[PDB]
Symmetry: D2
Subunit: 410 residues, 4 copies
């Protein structure tokens, strides 16, 4: 028998001429993007064939085999409904409803501390999905660049644990939420910052990455890493934000000096330069779409879902998801872990990097923040999502009442 | 095409007439115990048949026995259970057991002479999967008191009966942070897993009846969770708990002061109730079933009864994660990443959601009040298997995944 | 000496009329009922029988009366007392009184409907100087409970009997600070200081260990009597019952103190709570308490009797801790602006000491947000505005401030 | 009367030799270099130029010299000074000095090489009474940096120039409590009090706003000069450089203060830090600082010059906060046992005030666990053991305590 022919017979649906657009529509509905890096060979071959074939454009069983041979494994999984979310079309319908519902939540205040963060409209609201299989969906303003800000903190932590290991990184930074208040103290009882998700801790993590090269190269090292995570979709940098970050960052300077005082950095740190590096990393840009891929990498045990690259060690992914759970959302972390139960990280731009382990990554973005510094619409959507689907870290996969389970069906 | 006869062929392995012994040994190896409540009909029918003579079973006789329970027996035999190769897995649990056995550190709680009576050499581990597959090693049939292990169970009951929204009017939902205080910033105890919080939870259950009936209500509930296995009560522990519980009295009075209990609570009675609930007895085996119920979305795995609402199970697992192990909670959630609850008797109620429940018991506690061997075992377990809450199900590194075959 | 005083009081003319001597004596601030004046007054009473007539003293007859108490009478008349112009001073106290009277703010403790019984309009101020000069204005003879005002008194007793070193094994010596009066124990597992509930409860357990609560109470009461020069010291059983029937916080403290092994070996903690509640229910009037305060002002000698009541060690320690921990959450503010050893109580009492000058008791039931008598606190501020009494005022160069110790 | 004093000093009219008058004068505790004695000593210098074989003042010649300063000289000689047996008293200071000398424990601050340069054997004690009577023992003329001793002085200046109300908009008035300056700010987002680094830094930003750091420093120096009656005040640039090179903690505080908008509008925060570091690097000797302390003891009048230097408002506020916040983590213990307004510095200095009696400066580089001079702390304890100087001692009834104001 033949896998290619088996798929041909599936897609054929009654002829030996599967029209090209018909194959494309079938492929798109699996949630896969036509532009999937893992589908390049197949799409190149169809483009070629559309050039050489007599106008018409209907593949022979033989011609179809010619196109899909290269990528047959992945195409089969997609078509034979084997993906983590089999009925992806229905699911995106749900994401859209959740999107529209959160859209109505107009409260919140746009971060005003930079006239840059201030530049964005409060009406921007975007949601991007990327599953662990590379199935994609977006709604709203998902192609508008914005800064990660604190969303970057778990990513740089992952990089540090990836390169240095858990044991070394946690010599410098604790592993638990502060509890004590919001961001009040810099250090816990051991004279370390409480965890990697707090400013003090992020600043220390920053000082562990790529020690002994200049900030230009350090930045490149992190950016290349971020590129892998996003499957080479948009990752940029706002110098505007960077300038404003350093011009107004008195609190961070205070933290830096105190960290110096208490000998919190690795031997021979340049403590003013680390702050500069810190400010840069917070000024890196994403769109909803590219960040959702980053989240999906974390969802996928450190493999970028749309490229198949191993990006982070599973040790780094686990540690990062652990600390995103418990420390991810500033003062709301406890409440959030309790009600939503998802590893998530917020940013002052209005971003929420969200992971549903073994299912998907997401990025929600709406500039208006709540009292505690979390995107209003983002937080509303996170609640709704977990209301709707049995995704919450301590939900049951067998008994979950009136919840929908998107991994079931097909 | 015959559901029963199909399984008969499978068990038969050719030679017509599956011997009794051989069917029993095949059944036991799926991890099921012959005393499974869901296997009652089948085992009753085998007992009947084992009276009618003084041998083997026809495809007709086998069908006679297994017809009643064919669904469950098929799943077991067609290796469909959460852990397919359960025989291999128990081998691993045994290794983990022996390894933790060698950890002789720790101090037995001597604050009550009842707790001080126990030997530091006791060490037991019981497994119950969400499918009712069981395994034990060491001293798993020795009764001991839940103590603080009871806190999540009573909380589940409260949320089950009253709902999340009401219960959390009285008790917070997050870990405290500092070791010391009774109340958080909102004048509620920080969460249900702390003494102050447990005491308040206690005052929400079965309001408006006496302590005798309240206790019965909790017992009935505990019975469902354990699939009617051993649940007892140590009056000895209870007396010592009340005679020496100055701290708890202090908490009670402060809770009274700050008007923390529901309208017109008798706070000294609630303390009495509290002391009783901490003095309830389990064995490793029975408690592992309770844990398995929590693992199983509130359905008792060995009976199939709906015991707790999924809301109560989620909330309880959430708070066990983050507040379960006193001062070690943060470290534990980080390294082990399993909902767990410890008790001063040396108990550790452990849940791996969607896989199994466990109870580990060794009386010697570490500096922070957690069973030495229990804590060592929990670490080992997660070292070995991809069970940690944020492990990846697809890419995990030279970790074993017991759900795969 | 008697003759010298005779000539002084004489004012030349006839014989000194008896009422004239009485008016002169009263104006020195002394009360005719001074215990240290007993002999003199008895003799004048006798004489005003035994020679019934015009009722004027011979130089010889005056000598007959005053010989017994000539020392004290001389000091009073030769303007040698701590406040020489006492008549003028009381005029000032009256102005300060009236000014504080106009402060109508504050809420009366309702937590016992026994405490709730008092009118918010009650307001009294009593002065007793280190020399026994007295003055009162407003409702100074109305009995009220010390409540927390008793805490320094019992502490003094404990340090008096046991010494500083032993007592401070059980109780700390500094203000709490820690987000107000929330925790029971400091970092050493002791209550922060004797002025806090937790600390007072522990102090209570150090006094007269090994006798029953009836006798313990008597022991403290006899002590309190000496301090007040045997003026009114009473007990409100009503308050006591309400104190025990609603004191959940104190019970919480008791149990925690038990837990943490904070009491002396073999304490009955529930009995100590009972004792505690009793001591808080002891009654004073403004006048009698002002004498107690004056004893503290006077290095432990009761000013109106001359009895040695407390060791100087106990008086110093108590004044030290009244300075810094005396007024609950307001202690810091109070020490800064008023700079007086003071202790407040939920009845509306403020036991006030100006070391080396006088003791005072101010009472107005309405309390401010922090639990201090509104009018009491207002008066304390005014007093220190007016006179250079603040602990760190200068005795040489002060402002437009009046200095009542100067002529 | 000059003639009156001549007879007093005469011992027996025979013409009173020069050295004999000088010896008599020195014994009152006054130094011949007293600024208030300039006229007298100038006249004696003139007269001692005329003859060449001794001098032996006439009655009219003595009158010629002393007439200018007769008031002050009389008070000194007619034993009217605050301590009127000063010879005996200095004997006691010497004993206290020798006793504290034997306390060899403690660690010299090595955080700056300048502080590390000092010998642990240095130990000096200087007394200046509110009347200008002086005494010294040990290494009292060796310059050292005030460091934190400067904090109350700058605060006084700020309150002197701006008033209490304004200054306390920026800085709190109570001790930190939480522990030893772990937090920067209290609940109101102000540093807890002027004695903490955070608070001192803010106080620094209030003085002489709107001029450059050169002039600001000059302004403070001029003020310091007045306080010390123009005795030694200097500056260690070495210390200053080390202070700024290694003061990461202070920078941390600076940035946090900036963040929380704690400075007056349009402060240059990095410059205020620079100013701060300078002020901590100002040099004194035991002797000159003891005069500064005496000014605080004397309601803001420099005892050796009679100049009004600080308003009594500033002096009271400063003494208040020295009481309660003066000695870092030991403040509470110190206030309790010693009961004197005092301020320590990491150089080993302890600026000490006994209000209405005297100022002192003790210096020994070795610090205890909490950052206070070992010998300094030991001496303060001894001093209060010996004399009834403790803030809550009684002036009439004290123990086997000596009272140097009596005679
Ligand atoms: O352990 C010690 C000695 C010690 C040692 C090292 C460090 C220390 C203390 O610093 C403490 C750090 C302060 C945190 C305040 C949170 O900040 C807040 C602000 C506003 C409101 C609140 C908290 C909530 C609240 O009321 N919590 C309380 N819940 N129960 C209380 S209060 C009183 C019952 C008695 C239980 C109890 C508790 C403590 C101690 N003694 N007894 N003392
Ligand atoms: O916000 C305020 C006013 C306020 C408001 C609400 C409650 C308050 C006080 O009570 C404090 C409640 C907690 C005490 C934890 C005791 O338990 C501990 C014992 C030992 C160590 C530690 C904690 C950790 C630690 O100290 N880290 C740091 N130590 N110094 C730092 S960091 C650098 C200054 C941080 C910047 C800063 C400075 C001042 C304030 N806040 N932030 N003050």
């Amino acid at each position: 028998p033949s896998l290619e022919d088996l798929l041909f017979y599936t897609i054929a649906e009654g002829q030996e001429k599967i029209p090209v657009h018909k194959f494309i529509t079938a492929l798109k509905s699996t949630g896969l993007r036509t532009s999937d890096p893992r589908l390049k060979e197949c799409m190149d071959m169809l483009r070629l064939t559309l050039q050489t074939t007599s106008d018409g454009v209907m593949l022979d069983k033989d011609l179809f085999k010619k196109c899909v041979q290269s990528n047959i494994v992945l195409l089969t999984q997609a078509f034979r409904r084997k993906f983590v979310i089999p009925d992806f079309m229905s699911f995106t319908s749900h994401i859209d409803e959740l999107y529209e519902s959160a859209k109505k939540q107009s409260g919140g205040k746009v971060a005003d501390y930079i006239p840059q963060l201030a530049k964005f409209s409060p009406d921007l609201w975007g949601v991007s999905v990327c599953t662990v299989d590379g199935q994609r969906h977006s709604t709203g303003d998902t192609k508008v660049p914005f800064c990660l800000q604190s969303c970057v903190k778990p990513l740089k932590y992952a990089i540090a644990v990836n390169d240095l290991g858990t044991e070394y990184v946690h010599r410098y930074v604790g592993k638990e939420p502060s509890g004590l208040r919001f961001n009040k103290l810099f250090l816990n009882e051991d004279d370390k910052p409480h965890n990697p998700m707090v400013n003090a801790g992020a600043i220390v993590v920053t000082s562990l990455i790529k020690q002994g090269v200049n900030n230009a190269e350090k930045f490149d090292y992190v950016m290349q890493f971020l590129n892998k995570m996003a499957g080479n979709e948009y990752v940029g940098f706002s110098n505007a934000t960077f300038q404003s970050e350093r011009e107004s960052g008195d609190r961070n300077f205070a933290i830096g000096y105190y960290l110096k005082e208490k000998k919190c950095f690795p031997e021979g740190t340049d403590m003013v330069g680390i702050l500069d590096f810190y400010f840069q990393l917070c000024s890196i840009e994403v769109t909803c779409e590219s960040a959702s891929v980053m989240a999906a990498t974390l969802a996928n045990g450190g493999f970028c879902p749309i490229t198949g690259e191993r990006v982070l060690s599973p040790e780094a992914v686990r540690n990062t998801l652990s600390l995103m759970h418990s420390c991810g959302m500033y003062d709301f972390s406890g409440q959030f872990a309790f009600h939503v139960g998802l590893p998530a990280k917020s940013g002052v731009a209005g971003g929420i990097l969200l992971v549903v382990p073994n299912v998907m990554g997401m990025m929600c973005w709406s500039p208006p923040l709540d009292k505690m510094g979390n995107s209003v619409k983002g937080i509303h959507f996170c609640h709704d999502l977990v209301s709707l689907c049995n995704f919450h870290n301590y939900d049951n996969l067998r008994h979950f009442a009136k919840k929908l389970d998107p991994r079931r069906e097909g």
